[PDB]
Amino acid sequence: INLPITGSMDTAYANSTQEETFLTSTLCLYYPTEAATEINDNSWKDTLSQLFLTKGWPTGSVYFKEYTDIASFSVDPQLYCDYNVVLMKYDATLQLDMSELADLILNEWLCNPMDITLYYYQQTDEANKWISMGSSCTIKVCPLNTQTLGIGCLTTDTATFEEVATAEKLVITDVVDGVNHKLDVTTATCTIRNCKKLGPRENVAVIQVGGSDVLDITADPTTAPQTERMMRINWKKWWQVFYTVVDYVNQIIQAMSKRSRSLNSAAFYYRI
Amino acid sequence: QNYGINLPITGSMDTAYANSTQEETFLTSTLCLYYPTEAATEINDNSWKDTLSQLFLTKGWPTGSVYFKEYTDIASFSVDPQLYCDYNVVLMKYDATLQLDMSELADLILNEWLCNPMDITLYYYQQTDEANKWISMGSSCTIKVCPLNTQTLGIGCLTTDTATFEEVATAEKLVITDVVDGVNHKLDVTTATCTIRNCKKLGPRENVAVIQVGGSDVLDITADPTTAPQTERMMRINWKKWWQVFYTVVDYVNQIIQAMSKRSR
Amino acid sequence: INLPITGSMDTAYANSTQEETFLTSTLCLYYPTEAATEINDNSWKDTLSQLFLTKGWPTGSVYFKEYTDIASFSVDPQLYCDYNVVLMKYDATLQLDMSELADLILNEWLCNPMDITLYYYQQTDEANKWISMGSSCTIKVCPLNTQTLGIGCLTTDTATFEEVATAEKLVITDVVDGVNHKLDVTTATCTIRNCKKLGPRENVAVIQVGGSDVLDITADPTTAPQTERMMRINWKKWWQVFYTVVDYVNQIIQAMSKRSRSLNSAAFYYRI
Amino acid sequence: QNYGINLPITGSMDTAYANSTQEETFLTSTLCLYYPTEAATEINDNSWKDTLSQLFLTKGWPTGSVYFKEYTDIASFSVDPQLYCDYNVVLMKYDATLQLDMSELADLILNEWLCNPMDITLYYYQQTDEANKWISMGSSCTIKVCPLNTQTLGIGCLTTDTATFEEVATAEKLVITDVVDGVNHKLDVTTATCTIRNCKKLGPRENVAVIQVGGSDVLDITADPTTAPQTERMMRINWKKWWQVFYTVVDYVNQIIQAMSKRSR
Amino acid sequence: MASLIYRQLLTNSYTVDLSDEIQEIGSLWKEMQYNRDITIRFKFASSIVKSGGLGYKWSEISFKPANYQYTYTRDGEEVTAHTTCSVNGMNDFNFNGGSLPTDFVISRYEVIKENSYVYVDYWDDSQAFRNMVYVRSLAANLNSVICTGGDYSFALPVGQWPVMTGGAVSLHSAGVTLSTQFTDFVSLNSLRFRFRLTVEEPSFSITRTRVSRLYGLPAANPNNGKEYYEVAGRFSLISLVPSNDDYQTPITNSVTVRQDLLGELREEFNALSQEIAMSQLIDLALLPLDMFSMFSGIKSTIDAAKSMATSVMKKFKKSGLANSVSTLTDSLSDAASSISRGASIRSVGSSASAWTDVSTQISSISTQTSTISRRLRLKEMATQTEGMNFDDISAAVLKTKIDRSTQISPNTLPDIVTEASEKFIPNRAYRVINNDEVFEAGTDGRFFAYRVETFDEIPFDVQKFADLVTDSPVISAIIDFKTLKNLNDNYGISRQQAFNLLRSDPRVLREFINQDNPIIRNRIEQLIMQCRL
Ligand SMILES: *[C@@H]1O[C@H](CO)[C@@H](O)[C@H](O)[C@H]1NC(C)=O
Ligand SMILES: *[C@@H]1O[C@H](CO)[C@@H](O)[C@H](O)[C@H]1NC(C)=O
Ligand SMILES: *[C@@H]1O[C@H](CO)[C@@H](O)[C@H](O)[C@H]1NC(C)=O
Ligand SMILES: *[C@@H]1O[C@H](CO)[C@@H](O)[C@H](O)[C@H]1NC(C)=O
Ligand SMILES: [Ca+2]
Ligand SMILES: [Ca+2]
Ligand SMILES: [Ca+2]
Ligand SMILES: [Ca+2]
Ligand SMILES: [Ca+2]
Ligand SMILES: [Ca+2]
Ligand SMILES: [Ca+2]
Ligand SMILES: [Ca+2]
Ligand SMILES: [Ca+2]
Ligand SMILES: [Ca+2]
Ligand SMILES: [Ca+2]
Ligand SMILES: [Ca+2]
């Protein structure tokens, strides 16, 4: 809608959209198996339901989603809810994994597929990256010089390539933007897609349950931002975490806003 | 460049016709055919894809813009149909024992659904309006439903004895269930094998085009029995081979794309 | 005549031309042998004529012409009358055969013959098709490029061509319009002609005696038209069918209209 | 571009004579000769067709516009003559035993007939005007007629004893029957071998040109025994060979095409 | 100017004949960067054919093509390569000791000299030799080789042996072209270089004979036992890979093109018609866009860049335009010559003039005017006009469309230029001025007589309009009387502006088009939309 919008400053503030956005929206928590394990119960979901029922979120609005592992979740996340919350455990050995997950679900991507054998791909701008998903993505890449020959590599020998990943489930590969790269990837087990980053996804809310903030959404090491839907909690149990979430859900839904672009269930749009 | 906003558009009736978009939208778009395995079996060739692409080349669709995506059967294609292209054509064989399956498939792909998840074990749901339904996908869905009165008691069914529930599906790879809009139902599903989603039908996806290759037009998209409509992108052919079908699709692809309009969502 | 016509809206409606077009025209039914067999009579034709004589159609104006089957009729239909009615049964196997029969008789074609061994032909517009008749036409096609070489086929090995028709008595082939094709055909049994479709033949009238309306006259899968002189009946006998025809023949002839192009005894014009 | 109507035409006498259409119709039209097997026999040359085409090339007709179509005999040609070209020439031999046969052939091809079918078994037909005739074709026809009186009884014939009928044809491949116009006739015909059609004679077919290669002009196109006309496209030739005849045709083809005019229908 | 380009095509048509002679006696996009290195190892062959008798005489010692298949290292990968060497243009000498059966005779033997040329087709399994399907430029810089002949003894069963020795020539690389190697099921695209021969010091000789101090290289033993001769260098090659939205660079070039066949090119032209502007178009319609300037901005393929102008000319001299021109010239000549038996068809004018000979009439004055106006299209490209010369606007549209249109190809531009020249502005009007009285005319059967200062119609004086249009210069109807009068009424106009619009002057035209005059913008847009194809 290229058309403009006009307004004023004398108009009166309307009633609160809260207490109706709850009825007309849904909420979905994503929780790790560790939580249900430490809980050791089978009615905690109905308990949180009846608690939300006091906080104003009606009965058939809340949903829960167990995800066994951060990487297992990173493998093709399917988010279709008018409000999403994700409880992310801290693990220093998974810093880049749960930064890539953040960069993937917090923001909106427009993705084209990739045929490594029939084509040689590149980047255009500083927002055109290669996201690879799957069970074991071992990627290697050769940059080609001005005369379509390899730089520190050979177009025929895959050993000479530069290994950027090693048996990962999700990789966000950024390379020099303006050169042609040949690739070699485990195309049987992983699909790699050339995606452009767009305006953010205001529908999700990541909540790091452990240590100090580490998530670098921005792939350039100059911004290092911290957004409003990127939260942090200190934990020794999980019931306290869920009670916190319940008691302060209104603040989280103030930090979030329903998307504008379109309807979809994935972490990224497909446009071929 | 307002997003997610709607505003009045304005114009006039003296404007000169701007352009002629065919042969440019072709270059800047992608087309995707969805054919059955029967067709490749009858063809018995390893180069027919390249052949059809070279043919489309005459119609203007360049080489790396046309795609083919086989599907074993209507059921296998209805299980999570991931149509992601700028133009989609689907060929669909006729079988009187599959009318409802290949009408559900049409209702699913032709129309744009907004689908929230469903948790049966905890919550008891109801349909609000006439465009609210429950679409269940998976290997084999088996749905059973017990309507409930105002005091959360069953009507012709026992909330504890699942056997008393009323069966609406039996090992189907896709169900689209419409029940009495205004009463709460308790559901039973093979959740370990199939997923059910509470969906609302928005306007129609103008990106796809179904082509019934055989029998008469039977697709009752709208659940209500009064309309039984037939849209522009609901086509019909009579066949005795498949090469003729593909040649016809090619020779009349421009009409198909004039019948289809790129997405709004 | 390229000259223009003129008229007015104050002129009055003249008397009925029905009850004189019967006296100065002829009618010709085309029924299947199944009808005669089910009936098991000899003077049913005289019966129908003496019935017609009440509706106005005189004695020596009605004609009944038998055809053993749909394909036998499809092979060179010699319609030469001032009004033609055809009764055609329903058969899911012969669906396309009796759609091609419709496309052939309902419409007027201008046909040029073809010399396959010596030449290679193409199509120009959306109405230039290739119609082949005979005992069994088994056609195979191989498209070519600008330099007379095959596309997905080999010009020598006939077994690599694309078989569009396998043992069909009447075939109406539409191929991609713009490219040159090479054809392999059973010239000893079938003759194939490049025919352009002119305006409709308003002299004939098809009656589907059985199931739902399936005839797709126009080969493009967007129109799927239902023309005026394309009727449908449900049957358990044939006497009821013929009585319905006789009782509602004036409507059939009101939906038909004598030709304008020319006098010709064939179902298509021949102009070399 | 109105069709099926007759509108008044206008003109003048001040317009100038336009350039000639010959050497343009010669390219945008087609020619078709019909010769007897006797000619090819006497000749015994497998290249005479290409020779005559190369000779026509000088007179203007291109190579792929001329056609030669053989025929074994006048009667075997009279049996279902399917003439479809833009200029047709027919060569015809003189044989006193075939006078009426090769006059019927002329009266058939030179003229344009509006032909409806006939049901001998059921109906008893009659001729309304002097131009409604009954033309019968096949391998061998045997027609027998019986007129009727006011009360549907025979006149010198019995409606049951076919033998009493009057015999107008005896083992003929083509027959053109004109009977008393205004009385109902019954017919007996061997319909297994022959088909009879009730035809009405219209304006001449200006597309065909008959050439009697032999004796005096006997062809009486018109059935009334008062006119006995000789038309423009009704030619005669004297012969002792066939190469000379074909050279004559090739050298005087422009005169033939001037004596002929393309069809109106 | 923009019609001068058509005049130049017609003028330079004479090159099509010699081009066809040569051909007979012979027979979005992107860019990828070769200038890769190569080493060519090859060798010659020989074909010796002896006569019978006692064995002292030979009837042929000739050259023969020679294949070779080897492997070498480049950028750290072992690449398998394949060469094919042959020769052309050699001097066939002969030795003859007598007619007796026992006298040494070589009836014919070949020697390559400076007037010969050798060709070495090359191929390997790298990526360039599958990507070189659409080339933009090709040129190679290779070192030279010195190839010398070795000892060869003739097997005489009796007596002493003749010893062939010496001989040497230097191959330097001069010329690179494409070729093909034909396999059993597929074909391979290859790169054939041409080396020129330069004779060297060692003089070939035939011992025990009167042949010595004879330079060149014969076919007896050209390799001198060497397994091969080896040149080394770099080959520079540019590609026309049909890429897309700026990523996914192909490899193997991954495309087919319109060779599988205009139906859609016409639609492209009808989409590009109205986007064209008017002020800049009039600025471009005054430029003499001769062959270079018309065919420079086309990023052609290596064959189209060689035959583009000739390619369009060989079809441009087949069209209604060229045939009508030749017909007019023949009519004029036959009229100037045939007077004694003079062609008396018609003459609407003072005396017989081929410009005023109505014919093929399949109002009388309307017909005469249209028929006379169908030859002012020939006046346009016969330089007897004064104004914007409508074919010029047509050619400007053509040059403005064929620089944008993606669908342009070697087989394709020919007969597009001609369909343009034939179907651009089919109906078009012209005028002639005489003593301040303008007589117009148009091929659509319309005529208008009118005075310059005060536009008011007048009876159209035929037999005077013809006498004037025959000899006097003509003008075009870009500003035709209808729009001219609408303008003089609404947008009140001055004497000089009106005179310049009658003369169809681009200065005043572009001045109105910049003053935003809809009564001229509409007319120019009509002309564009008629220039549709
Ligand atoms: C807005 O809020 C005020 C204060 O609570 C309330 O009085 C008013 O009714 C609200 N507006 C509407 C439209 O209900
Ligand atoms: C038309 O019908 C009217 C009413 O029956 C009758 O009076 C009239 O004569 C008819 N027209 C002719 C031409 O007979
Ligand atoms: C007819 O002849 C005249 C006189 O030579 C000539 O001017 C005219 O162009 C000719 N007609 C055609 C169609 O060429
Ligand atoms: C049509 O053309 C105008 C200008 O010629 C351009 O601004 C517009 O974007 C074009 N329309 C489309 C759909 O590209
Ligand atoms: Ca990772
Ligand atoms: Ca980057
Ligand atoms: Ca390396
Ligand atoms: Ca189903
Ligand atoms: Ca029950
Ligand atoms: Ca419902
Ligand atoms: Ca058929
Ligand atoms: Ca094949
Ligand atoms: Ca077609
Ligand atoms: Ca006879
Ligand atoms: Ca008798
Ligand atoms: Ca008579």
The closest CB to that of A180, out of E36, E127, E249, belongs to: E249
CA of D187 to the centre of ligand 15 (A): 13
Q: How far apart are CA E1 and CA D219, in angstroms?
A: 69
* Experimental approach: cryo-EM
The response to whether residue E331 sits with its C-beta less than 6 Å from ligand 3 reads yes
Report the residue of C2, C146, C180 to disrupt the E interface, i.e. the one with the largest count of E CBs within 10 Å.
Answer: C146
The closest CB to that of D85, out of C5, C263, C272, belongs to: C272
Structure tokens at D244: 């000379």
Provide the H-helix boundaries in E432-517: 465-471, 481-490, 495-502, 506-514
Can you give D114-138 as a three-state secondary structure string?
Answer: EEECCCCCCCCECCCCCCEEEEEEE
Ligand nearest to the CA of residue B176, numbered in listed order: 8
Q: What is the resolution of this structure in A?
A: 3.4
Q: Which of A271, A137, A134 is nearest to A195 (CA)?
A: A271
Q: How far apart are CA C140 and CA E329, in angstroms?
A: 52
E264·B27 Cβ contact <8 A: no
Strand-pair partners of E146: E170
Amino acid identity at C100: E
Q: How far apart are CA E428 and CA E152, in angstroms?
A: 80
The response to whether residue B21 sits with its C-beta less than 6 Å from ligand 4 reads yes
Residues in CB range of E244: below 8 A, 6 or more apart: B62, B64, E28
Q: How far apart are CA A68 and CA A72, in angstroms?
A: 7
C-beta separation of E222 from E168 below 8 A: no
Q: Indicate the pairing of strand D234-236 with strand D208-212.
A: parallel
Within 13 Å of residue B217, how many CA atoms lie on the same side as its CB?
21
Residues in CB range of E34: below 8 A, 6 or more apart: A147, A148, E128, E132, E235, E236, E237, E238, E239
Q: How far apart are CA A123 and CA A120, in angstroms?
A: 11
E35·A147 Cβ contact <8 A: yes
DSSP assignments along E107-156, one per residue: EEEEEE-TT-EEEEEEEESSSHHHHTTSEEEEEEEE--EEEE---EE---
Best residue among B19, B21, B23 to mutate for probing ligand 4, ranked by most atoms within 8 Å of CB? B19
| D102 Rama class: left (phi>0) / alpha (psi -120 to 50) / beta | alpha
C-beta separation of C150 from C144 below 8 A: yes
Q: Is the dihedral of CA C160, C165, C166, C169 positive or negative?
A: negative
Structure tokens at A149: 């020959």
Q: How far apart are CA A141 and CA A121, in angstroms?
A: 10
E359·D14 Cβ contact <8 A: no
Cα angle D254, D256, D257 (rounded to 5 degrees) comes to: 65
The response to whether residue B15 sits with its C-beta less than 6 Å from ligand 4 reads no
Structure tokens at B225: 């029995």
Q: How far apart are CA A78 and CA A105, in angstroms?
A: 10
Residues in CB range of B242: below 8 A, 6 or more apart: B38, B39, B42, B43
A160 is in an annotated binding site: yes
C-beta separation of E424 from E2 below 8 A: no
CA of B164 to the centre of ligand 9 (A): 4
Q: How far apart are CA B199 and CA B135, in angstroms?
A: 7
Amino acid identity at B220: D
What is the side-by-side strand order in the sheet with E152-153? E152-153, E163-165, E204-206, E211-214
Q: How far apart are CA E320 and CA E310, in angstroms?
A: 19
CA of D126 to the centre of ligand 16 (A): 9
Phi first, then psi: what are they for A187, rounded to 5°?
-55, -20
C-beta separation of B27 from E406 below 8 A: yes
Residues in CB range of E486: below 8 A, 6 or more apart: E519
C-beta separation of A258 from A220 below 8 A: no
CA distance E196 to chain C (A): 34
Q: Which of C170, C175, C179, C124 is nearest to C268 (CA)?
A: C170
Can you give chain B as a three-state secondary structure string?
Answer: CCCCCCCCCCCCCCCCCCCCCCCCCCCCCCEEEECEHHHHHHHCCCCHHHHHHHHHHHHCCCHHHEEECCECCHHHHHCCCCCCCCEEEEEECCCHHHHHHHHHHHHHHCEEEEEEECCCCCCCECCCCCCEEEEEEEEEECCEEEEECCCCCECCCCCCCHHHCEECCCCEEEEEECCCCCCEEEEECCCCCEEEEEEEEEEECCCEEEEECCCCCCCCCCCCCCCCCCCCCEEECCCCCCHHHHHHHHHCHHHHHHHCCCCCC
CA dihedral D130, D131, D134, D135 (to 10 degrees): 140
Measured in whole angstroms, how far is the alpha carbon of residue E445 from the centre of its chain? 39
C-beta separation of E461 from E449 below 8 A: yes
The response to whether residue E344 sits with its C-beta less than 6 Å from ligand 3 reads no
Q: Which of C41, C83, C32, C27 is nearest to C209 (CA)?
A: C32
Cα Rg of chain A (Å, integer): 21
What does each C-alpha distance from D150 to C46, C243, D159, D183, D186 come to in angstroms?
Answer: 21, 32, 14, 8, 14
Q: How far apart are CA D133 and CA D118, in angstroms?
A: 12
Secondary structure element (H or E) that encloses residue E309, with its range: helix E309-316
Amino acid identity at C11: T
Structure tokens at D109: 């091809």
Ligand nearest to the CA of residue D198, numbered in listed order: 16
Q: Which of C223, C219, E324, E6 is nearest to B251 (CA)?
A: C219
DSSP assignments along C47-80, one per residue: HHHHHHHHHT--GGGEEEEEES-HHHHHSS----
Q: How far apart are CA D147 and CA D155, in angstroms?
A: 6
Of all protein residues, the one whose alpha carbon is nearest to atom 10 of ligand 3 is: D19
DSSP structure class, residue C28? E
Neighbours of A165 (CB within 10 A): 21
Q: Which of E421, B55, D153 is nearest to C153 (CA)?
A: B55
DSSP assignments along E351-386, one per residue: S--GGG-------HHHHHHHHHHTTHHHHHTTT-B-
The response to whether residue B19 sits with its C-beta less than 6 Å from ligand 4 reads yes
Angle of helix E14-26 relative to helix E309-316, nearest 10 degrees? 110
End-to-end CA distance of chain C: 23
Structure tokens at C76: 């060179």
Q: Which of C85, C105, C104, C100 is nearest to C233 (CA)?
A: C85
Structure tokens at E362: 């399949």
Q: Indicate the pairing of strand C269-270 with strand C107-113.
A: parallel
Count CB pairs under 8 A between chains D and E: 14
C-beta separation of D56 from D253 below 8 A: yes
